[PDB]
Amino acid sequence: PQVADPEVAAMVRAEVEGRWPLGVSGLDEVVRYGLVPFGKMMGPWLLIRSALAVGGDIATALPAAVALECVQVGAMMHDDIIDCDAQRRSKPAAHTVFGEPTAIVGGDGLFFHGFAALSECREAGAPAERVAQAFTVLSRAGLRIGSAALREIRMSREICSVQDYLDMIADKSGALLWMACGVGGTLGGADEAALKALSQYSDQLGIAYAIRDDLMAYDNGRPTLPVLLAHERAPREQQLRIERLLADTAAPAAERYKAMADLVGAYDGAQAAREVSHRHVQLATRALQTLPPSPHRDALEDLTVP
């Protein structure tokens, strides 16, 4: 290869740890609680690779990667307030620890640390025209995620078309990926064709990740793709009860759950979901081939492979 290959996920952690280190107080303490433990940090990792994949600078993509981390943690800290399915492995919710008002302010401080970190990209050398278009990309993507999250709450206990669900999770998971790739590609100086490719890669990989989440239950009241594909195939009589249990509000969820795995298994909803997920992974790798060959494009391609 002609370009280098850094260790992205470890570099971002050093930058976030530097900005909000151990021992912070005030609002920084609530910001740090949301950030740590760090974990994979795939969002920021995706932005830097997307920036470097088109010729960008690490120094320009780095503050935007912190911005990506802050916005994602801000959205997670607020989503924990309105949604409550506490997996016994889930990190204790910030509202459980600090109280609901502090989780509200804390998530907002994370959002504005994001905007402030993205504002620093100008100081890092990016042209002012690029920083503003990055904010436009960042802002529009966040609006897609927000709109999808609300329809996710509203569409619970209801059966929807399979295509509506795909459009649903694309605006939540795909926009979450596009926000990293679109801002990374923008600051890297990508032309319109590369940004469209990174947009296609984001949408297609985002569908795959969303389906993968539906599958770990089978490998809430939320409609999932295996149930939806199973409903599509089941004859009329099984379709009604599939609808009536999800519509049901006063029947044990544990029995509705196991009475749902029976329908998904009977009509191969789980396997049908993998093939749909497989179809979109192939479209994601296809989209990447537009980008110039590099280790960064290789890193983005490997990410599709489970």
Ligand X SMILES: CC(C)=CCC/C(C)=C\CC/C(C)=C\CSP(=O)(O)OP(=O)(O)O
Q: Which residues form the interface with ligand X (CB under 6 A)?
A: 75-76, 78-79, 105, 108-109, 142, 145-146, 149, 172-173, 176, 210, 213
Please identify which residue in 1, 23, 37, 101 interacts with a copy of itself, judged by CB under 8 A. 101
Binding of a copy of itself at residue 142 (CB under 8 A)? Answer: yes
Query: What values do phi and psi take at 15, rounded to 5?
Result: -75, -45
**196 CB-near residues (< 8 Å, 6+ apart):** 290
Cβ(300)–Cβ(53) below 8 Å: yes
Binding of a copy of itself at residue 301 (CB under 8 A)? Answer: no
Q: Which residues bind Mg ion (CB under 5 A)?
A: 79
**Beta carbons within 10 angstroms of residue 84's beta carbon:** 9
Residue 4 DSSP SS3: coil
∠ CA 216-222-228 to the nearest 5 degrees? 80
Please identify which residue in 7, 129, 219, 302 interacts with a copy of itself, judged by CB under 8 A. 129
Cβ(264)–Cβ(218) below 8 Å: yes
Cβ(223)–Cβ(165) below 8 Å: yes
SS (H, E, C) 85-149: CCCCCCCCCHHHHHCHHHHHHHHHHHHHHHHHHHHHHHHCCCCHHHHHHHHHHHHHHHHHHHHHH
Please state the closest distance from residue 76 (CB atom) to a copy of itself, in A. 12
How many whole angstroms separate alpha carbon 95 and alpha carbon 92? Answer: 8
Q: Is 20 left (phi over 0), alpha (psi -120 to 50) or beta?
A: beta
Residue 213 touches which member of ligand X, a copy of itself, Mg ion, none, C-beta under 5-8 Å by kind: ligand X
How many whole angstroms separate alpha carbon 49 and alpha carbon 6? Answer: 10
Cβ(204)–Cβ(159) below 8 Å: no
Q: Which residue has the tokens 């910030």?
A: 94
Residue (61 or 149) nearer to ligand X, CB:
149
**Helix then strand then coil, % of the chain, to nearest 5:** 75, 0, 25
Residue (36 or 105) nearer to Mg ion, CB:
105
Residue 106 touches which member of ligand X, a copy of itself, Mg ion, none, C-beta under 5-8 Å by kind: a copy of itself
Residue (78 or 280) nearer to a copy of itself, CB:
78
Question: Where does this chain touch a copy of itself (CB under 8 A) — which range of 35-43, 137-145, 243-251, 297-305?
Answer: 137-145
Residue 119 touches which member of Mg ion, a copy of itself, ligand X, none, C-beta under 5-8 Å by kind: a copy of itself
Please identify which residue in 38, 135, 218, 257 interacts with a copy of itself, judged by CB under 8 A. 135
Binding of a copy of itself at residue 156 (CB under 8 A)? Answer: no
Cβ(44)–Cβ(95) below 8 Å: no
Cβ(55)–Cβ(33) below 8 Å: no
Residue 135 touches which member of ligand X, Mg ion, a copy of itself, none, C-beta under 5-8 Å by kind: a copy of itself
Binding of a copy of itself at residue 105 (CB under 8 A)? Answer: yes
Residue 139 touches which member of ligand X, a copy of itself, Mg ion, none, C-beta under 5-8 Å by kind: a copy of itself
Residue 292 touches which member of Mg ion, a copy of itself, ligand X, none, C-beta under 5-8 Å by kind: none
Please state the closest distance from residue 100 (CB atom) to a copy of itself, in A. 7
How many whole angstroms separate alpha carbon 82 and alpha carbon 54? Answer: 38
Please state the closest distance from residue 63 (CB atom) to a copy of itself, in A. 12
- For a copy of itself, the binding residues (CB under 8 A) are 26-27, 30, 74-75, 78, 81-82, 99-102, 104-109, 111-113, 115-116, 118-120, 122, 127-129, 131-133, 135-136, 138-140, 142-143, 146-147, 149-151, 153
